[PDB]
Amino acid sequence: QFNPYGDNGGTILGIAGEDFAVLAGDTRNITDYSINSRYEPKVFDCGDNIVMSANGFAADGDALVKRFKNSVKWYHFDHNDKKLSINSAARNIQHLLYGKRFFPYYVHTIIAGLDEDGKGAVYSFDPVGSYEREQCRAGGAAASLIMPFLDNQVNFKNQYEPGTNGKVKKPLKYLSVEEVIKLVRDSFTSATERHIQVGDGLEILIVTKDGVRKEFYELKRD
Amino acid sequence: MDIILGIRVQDSVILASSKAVTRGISVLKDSDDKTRQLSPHTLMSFAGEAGDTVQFAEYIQANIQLYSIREDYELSPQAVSSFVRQELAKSIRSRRPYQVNVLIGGYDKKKNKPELYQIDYLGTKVELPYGAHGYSGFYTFSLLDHHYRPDMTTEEGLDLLKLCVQELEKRMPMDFKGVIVKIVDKDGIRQVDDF
């Protein structure tokens, strides 16, 4: 019987700071136990200071990204070149996803950019368009390995103030871009160690009010 | 849903319908009225698939009320029952059939007779002295075969109904949270408030 879905592996990760946000993903693409490519990007600049990744079944991921990019194009055409805010992108993507509720896109979607007050924002979606804004999200194959690390290191979960008798939590605070890139790089090397579908390369898109910058790092190729 | 009964006595039709609404391992409600007034002298009780029951009942109610307004006249219980049967008979061969069973109790004012119709989801119609849908019938039919008489009063009918509810509360596996009882006669439709 023909199975219209496949699984291309990889994993993605979004972190939001005070005046920036990052969207990272490995560059490995796989099916079963074979590597298809060691460098096939899956995080994209979509215009209007929005970056997007839709990880899982790549064909669905590409279709969705294409549709959203196109949605941004027509938003300009129809509303006098107005900037598509991250909250508006998120809601639009919900409708893109839920429109295929009964034949879903098999992807975990994350977008990152800046909210309307210039603060860093990360939005994540389930495959049929449930969504939520967060400081923090890992998605894809190694999500279960990385996400609890992020709860601990980004949101300081289960961490208390020493000598306060486990009564005063470690206080929340925004991270510098330098600190965030450190957590991203460590998250991915750890994920690469223990997950076979993660490796080869890491591409990070950083989003500030001056635009979108990229950084790339080698990952273990086994 | 589950328990719906009906008895026709000399001068009225009595409908008894369980109050419980259960989903999973939770009784969500214990005061549910499983009935719709179709016209001032016609009442319909219903049981079956969740959602389907009320959707069907209200849809029939809307159609009968429309007819009443259009002709300034009340359709006879026999006529209403035939309309309802046809709707269910169509439904059973649809893409998704209504899984609803009904009892229609009405007082025909032209004949001055009470009438009870039992119709299942397939559109199987029968006029009866007493009726039941679901597992209820497995206790009540035999009980009523024994105790029922054609010329009973409304009060005798209610006592006969107490017997049925008692037996069901003794031998039925489920807690159906009692019944709401309604009487249909020459003066219309009313509800007994302590049962």
Binding site: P148, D151, K157, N158, S187, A191, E193 | -
Partner: protein
């Protein structure tokens, strides 16, 4: 219908400088229903420690079995069983039930009392030994534990530092698993003193 995730729970073990740590959560449930908050998954036979995750009836049975076997071992050998040896006994005993196994994920930790070496190991349900320098993980939140351990861990931690690290790995992994948590215990094991600490964690 998957016996390894009916009751839930986790076990993690780590090595440090002249010490080992082994920790578990305290949950015992029946699918969604949490039943007990006191179900410890770590046992000891002399100075050798065994943690067992998986089906709770088998966890209990295997503890009773290894107590039995180590008691007879001690009587005949006139010494306490060492971790390297116990590890082998665990492996034999599980593989003996190859085609009708105990649905468990055992973890061994302790210090060899002759050589002073810290030792940890993990097993699959069918007896396969996984010996490791660093850490062993087990249970329904094992993915999470692998993630936490692989990033948090560093070699040669002092007992009080190792305690923080293993505790944070357990806690944050448990909190991303619906079937693990409801309390936690951490054993810090040095050559001849063993401290047992109960952790404060979220109770949902």
């Amino acid at each position: 219908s998957d016996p390894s995730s009916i009751n839930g729970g986790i076990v993690v073990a780590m090595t440090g400088k002249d010490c080992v740590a082994i920790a578990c959560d305290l949950r015992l449930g029946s699918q969604s229903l949490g039943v007990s908050n006191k179900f410890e998954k770590i046992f000891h036979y002399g100075h050798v420690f065994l943690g067992i995750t998986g089906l709770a009836t088998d966890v209990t049975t295997l503890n009773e079995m290894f107590r039995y076997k180590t008691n007879l071992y001690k009587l005949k050998e006139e010494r306490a069983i060492e971790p390297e040896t116990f590890t082998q006994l665990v492996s034999s005993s599980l593989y003996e039930r190859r085609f009708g196994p105990y649905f468990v994920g055992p973890v061994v930790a302790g210090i060899n009392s002759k050589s002073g070496k810290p030792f940890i190991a993990g097993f699959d349900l069918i007896g396969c030994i996984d010996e490791a320098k660093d850490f062993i993980v087990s249970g329904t939140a094992s993915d999470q534990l692998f993630g936490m351990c692989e990033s948090l861990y560093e070699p040669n931690l002092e007992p009080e530092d190792l305690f923080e690290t293993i505790s944070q790995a357990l806690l944050n992994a448990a909190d991303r698993d619906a079937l693990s948590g409801w309390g936690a215990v951490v054993y810090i094991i040095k050559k001849d003193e063993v401290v047992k600490r109960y952790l404060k964690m979220r109770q949902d």
